[PDB]
Ligand binder design. Structure first.
Ligand code: DD0
Ligand code: DD0
Ligand code: LYS
Ligand code: LYS
Lengths: 462, 462
């Protein structure tokens, strides 16, 4: 019902030649600027520094000859205003009382004082916007269907939104210090490749074909290495037409990075530094506090373990690239398609779940890693690592497969479970120098650093 | 046929326990690093600075006891190598001659000398990648179907790719200096809005509905202002399921920016500075040279003209918001749906086409601008500008419409040519402070600054 009273203050303001939504207002400082300015003001004393400020009224204490409001800026910073009879306007005070609700954006010019809390004592005042919905005094999934309200009433939502923006800045800073170049590769592709996922298709009207949103930029980033890029990345959305869960969404921000003439050994060291540098820039500590109330140390060096050896110790027997699927299925049952899949799953179900300190696992089954180079010395495994931080599958890197005839086979196997990415394979046969790629999910980065769910990390999900 | 000889050098290299695609090679410096190091070396003299370098062989001059190649790095920098009998390997020289083609990535360790041009005289040498396609010695649309080849053989394609990356860096730098925060808003939306375009739809499997790729981020960026963001932008892809032409593609990179408590007057000044700052950072001059051989001055202040007045002078009669469509159609015929559309078109066909210096046109027909605030003083027009640079429709800005009941109407009109964006309108009725948005196309920015077509500006189009 308050929806109607509010619409009728707008109307009776328009009729009266009052502007409820004025083009401009001369806001001289932010309330943060007015705070940093008067940090220690002897309380109940006045100062002749004049300011125009605008804020959202989020409390009002109306009292005859004197109204007090709390004006909150968009960052949450608060200044109190004092709409007084005596300064200017009995009619201003009546206008104030009658026209000004809660959730109203409001400009006030005048003197900066501290009362018997930092306030502005009004020379003038005007409305900048008239709200036709009162602020509520909120469930998770209603907070997320209405982030704009969440950001006004919930300081934490402000803190989280700024945090992600700061993490993303810190990332670009870290990669740019190291000579990486940020490139833009296609989101619409004739076939989507470079990961294991079911793509979003769309019809094009220009071309009268179906196109596919990128599952991953890897294949196009590898054409940039062929093309002569030394050090490239791309920090931008990927689209995977699968289910949502606590570490999975169909649209999410993902970093990929390629460095020429380094291996997975080299890109492990960079991923650690990059994460540690981000924590410092954006959180101020490598001793990460959690909603637990616990503290997760990500400082220092990080453990590396091999999948097969670590799996062997966990199962009490030698598991090699040679170990048959009949053997592996057997073990699987004893707990509760093919070899590559079984190793990773058995590993995930035994070693994976027990991890707590930040660990790299490396040397992976050749079957489940079609784009990564065969290991230099160990037959049957690829030079790939997964990074687990606070138990989250955070990041991965490869020594990259630059052999086209091998790469052709890897795909010819995939498919038989038969059109390949012939222009990608074309690019490799022009010669791709030896290089190491990485990938990392921005949402998993935040979750691993904060505790925050994926539906708190993204501004506008669904 | 050379496709077959090459595949058979790979095979007879694998059989021989030679690695044609080795995991690693110990590249100590880039050829650029080796150049900056020995800038003035008394020619035909040797120096005992040892380096490992890797490059692509893009010339070979094989000559009995001594082979010369030009090794080109990926940035185009060149060093010459001298594979000699006498330094190490008669068998190395035979291996060189027999195994090493053109378009082959190649590592060589040894001494840095200048011959009778800066070269490395080989202690060792190894292949890093074996190319199974010779470099061609290329049409526009074959250069663009194969950018990876273009980047190797065409220096200009290198220069253009780096230029775009530098423009994009310069933009983020400029907006961040000014306190703007970069946000990520959804690409997949339940309905796409904030511009005039036909969207790409896609089916979701999670939700079993159609979703739509964003035509523009405006509606979501306005929820961030409601939400308390002072100064926001977003530099990221938009998707418009329309035709391609010389200033139009269905996927393109687009900047949008919102500033609270400024108008279109304010965002005109920022757009000029932003463009001028970009030119300086990324081009080194505001006196922009073109393929013409001409020079386009973008320095100094820029002309502002009003649409209706400028149109009037061009047509020889008073054209106002009042001027009927019958009158406008009449004029249209005399040269060769509704009022708003007719003003902009007549303007575009007379005043628009005659512009050369960088000009802002402002005060627009209310009909063709549903999201921009009605002008403060002039009835019938909206506070909007278009910026024309070297005759390209580069950028636009609005004093933003924060009135929900007006905004509801603007849409209720649109539709009747009836489901609206009710959550967007919901956000406005919580109150959006007065603000000014802008938008600019990155491809048009480059085209306007360089002369370059849209199909040279984007790394991987189609
Ligand atoms: C919500 O985020 C995701 N959503 C989906 N649906 N799928 C993935 C993520 C994610 O973060 N992924 C990682 C993961 O594979 C760790 C190593 C590689 C980097 C990554 F981004 F792909 C996969
Ligand atoms: C290849 O780029 C584009 N492609 C399409 N299909 N549509 C537009 C562009 C572009 O650059 N556009 C500008 C233009 O409207 C100038 C003022 C606003 C900014 C913009 F990016 F929308 C529209
Ligand atoms: N394309 C990979 C990330 C890069 C891996 C290294 N080349 C993925 O989506 O998992
Ligand atoms: N959404 C606009 C750009 C922003 C205009 C200012 N609010 C467009 O695509 O043209």
């Amino acid at each position: 019902e308050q929806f109607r009273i509010r619409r009728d203050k707008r109307a009776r303001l328009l009729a009266q030649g009052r502007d409820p939504y004025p083009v401009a207002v001369p806001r001289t400082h932010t309330l943060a600027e007015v705070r940093a300015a008067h940090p220690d003001l002897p309380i109940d004393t006045a100062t002749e520094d004049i300011v125009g400020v605008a804020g959202r009224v989020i409390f009002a204490r109306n009292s005859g000859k004197l109204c007090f409001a709390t004006l909150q800026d968009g960052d949450g910073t608060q200044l109190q205003v004092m709409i007084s009879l005596d300064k200017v306007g009995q009619a201003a005070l009546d206008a104030w009382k009658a026209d000004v609700d809660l959730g109203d954006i409001v400009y006030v010019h005048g003197a900066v004082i501290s009362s018997r809390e930092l306030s502005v004592l009004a020379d003038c005042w005007r409305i900048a916007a008239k709200s036709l919905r009162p602020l509520p005094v909120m469930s998770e999934e209603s907070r997320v269907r209405q982030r704009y309200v969440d950001l006004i009433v919930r300081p934490e939502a402000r803190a989280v939104a700024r945090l992600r923006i700061a993490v993303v800045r810190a990332i670009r800073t870290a990669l740019q210090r190291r000579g990486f170049l940020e490139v833009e590769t296609p989101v619409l592709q004739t076939l989507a490749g470079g990961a294991a996922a079911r793509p979003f298709a769309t019809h094009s009207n220009a071309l009268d074909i179906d196109l596919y949103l990128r599952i991953a930029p890897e294949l196009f980033l590898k054409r940039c290495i062929v093309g002569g890029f030394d050090k490239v990345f791309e920090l931008n959305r990927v689209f995977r037409n699968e289910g949502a869960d606590s570490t999975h969404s169909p649209e999410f921000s993902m970093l990929e990075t390629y460095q020429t003439y380094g291996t997975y050994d080299d890109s492990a060291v960079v991923t650690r530094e990059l994460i540690q540098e981000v924590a410092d820039e954006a959180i101020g500590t490598r001793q990460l506090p959690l909603p637990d109330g616990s503290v997760y140390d990500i400082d220092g060096e990080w453990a590396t373990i091999q999948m097969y050896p670590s799996l062997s110790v966990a199962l009490g027997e030698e598991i090699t690239p040679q170990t048959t699927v009949d053997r592996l299925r057997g073990i699987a049952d004893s707990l509760g398609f093919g070899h590559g899949k079984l190793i990773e799953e058995l590993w995930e179900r035994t070693v994976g779940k027990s991890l707590s300190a930040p660990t790299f696992v490396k040397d992976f089954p050749v079957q489940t890693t079609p784009l990564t180079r065969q290991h230099r010395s160990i037959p049957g495994v690829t030079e790939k690592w997964d990074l687990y931080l606070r138990g989250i599958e955070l990041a991965t890197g490869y020594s990259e497969l630059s052999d086209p005839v091998v790469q052709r086979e890897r795909f010819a196997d995939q498919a038989r479970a038969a059109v390949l990415d012939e222009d990608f394979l074309a690019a490799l046969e022009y010669g791709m120098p030896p290089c190491t790629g990485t990938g990392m999910g921005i949402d998993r980065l935040l979750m691993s650093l904060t505790g925050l769910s994926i539906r708190e990390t993204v501004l506008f999900p669904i």
